[PDB]
Amino acid sequence: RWYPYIDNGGTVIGLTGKDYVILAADTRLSLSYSIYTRFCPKISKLTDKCIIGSSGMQSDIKTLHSLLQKKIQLFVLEHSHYPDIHVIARLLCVILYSRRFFPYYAFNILAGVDENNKGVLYNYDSVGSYCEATHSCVGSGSQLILPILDNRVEQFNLGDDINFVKDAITSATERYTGDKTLIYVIDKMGINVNTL
Amino acid sequence: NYLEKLNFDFKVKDVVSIRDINLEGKEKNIETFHDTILLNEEKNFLKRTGLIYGSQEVYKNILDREIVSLSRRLPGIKSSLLSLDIVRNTIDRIDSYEYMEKIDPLEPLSEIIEKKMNI
């Protein structure tokens, strides 16, 4: 009589671009009410132009990120080239479906920039059915953050998109959203971590 | 992890048997407990021996049991396995797996040799 699943919180927002992707997220953790810390890194770096961010329970997302990094390093060492974001997406899908009857409590978002200089963001679910989403978010804030994204993106430079992401996440905190934000951005010359 | 491993074998439906409802999850019911009725007891015995005496005793016991069990007839005709009974010290004991019987149907003898020892 012990359910091995709990909601730890997370509001990983996503936004693509012409040649950039903005996978911002929070750095706050809480069991149900009380907060564990105020700085919990969750955005795990996969490759120099690809990252992953999720709002699931901390143990499953950390194990999944570490396993994906191990598989990517094995792929790099045995093949001597970085995997593509499509390859990483298919690997993540197969990994997630490998545990289908005992699924990961992890809503992944795989962000990156293709070799053809095109930002792509892939939203995921528990089992693995993913989609190429121009704007997406997961977790508790997904009810409140998505319609702003449809209003804005669906209806521009990277600065305006970064400012819109900052305004949206701060509005979400005003509306377990978080207290500090890490605005990751993947330009044409690698990732640039921007604490906020 | 579990449930075998997919390998694009392409032979999923056989003309000898049908898949079980649980496949290989092996849900805990009375038949599952009775399946692991002898493996668990010998696990306890090897635990006792290699704990108190040293793991070399468990090593010698397992190699002797595999060697005497390796000395048996081919699949088909039932093997007496007397030497295994002497080594495991079950010749003095008569138990439920000795008496009773299971009658067993669709597999040719050559498929049984392929299944038993991987040819």
Binding site: - | K11, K13, V15, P108, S110, E111, I119
Partner: protein, 233 residues
Amino acid sequence: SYDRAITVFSPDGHLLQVEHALEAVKKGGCAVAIKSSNFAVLAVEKKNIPKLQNPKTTEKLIKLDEHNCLAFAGLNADARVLVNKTRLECQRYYLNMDEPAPVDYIAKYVAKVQQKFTHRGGVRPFGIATLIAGFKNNKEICIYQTEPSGIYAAWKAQAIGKNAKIVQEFLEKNYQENMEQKDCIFLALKAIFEVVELSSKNVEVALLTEKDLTFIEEQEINSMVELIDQERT
């Protein structure tokens, strides 16, 4: 022995065990097969003791499935075991497709099994060289011919067994394309009797059509062997 390489490479790059299987095949009985249009006559040498032995039990032109059929030369028990394996495999394939098994798939499977017995420990090579005849999924008659080494190749008119080379040369010299049923049966009978004594009791020829494997009656065989005896002189 269990987990022991019975067949291994020799100093001159040859598998001596597979070679021994090859002359074991050559010491076996003869068997001829012809193809034309949409049918394939098949013949095997019959060897029975008169007045004591039962010809009915001695069967060589078995049918594997609805369409494919198999003849063999060499070890009979090995042939029976591989026949059981191939029939079970044909029913497995017909379960997954719900369509009849083509000749090419079962020929490749026979080649795979005969290769496996030449590459696994504790198994000797199969001492037979079976040749399969049947229709593909395209519904075109074709014949394949496996060996103990596992090599297979499509054939138009091939023979096996004792004195195989003489029958192969005769068929290569005399074979025509798009022949009649009587012509095909006559050619098969002449081909097997080139290396077999001319008698009705030493042949059990049957014709494979899309309906079935029809065994030729004894009277037709008697008439044809008498005709061949007349033509010889």
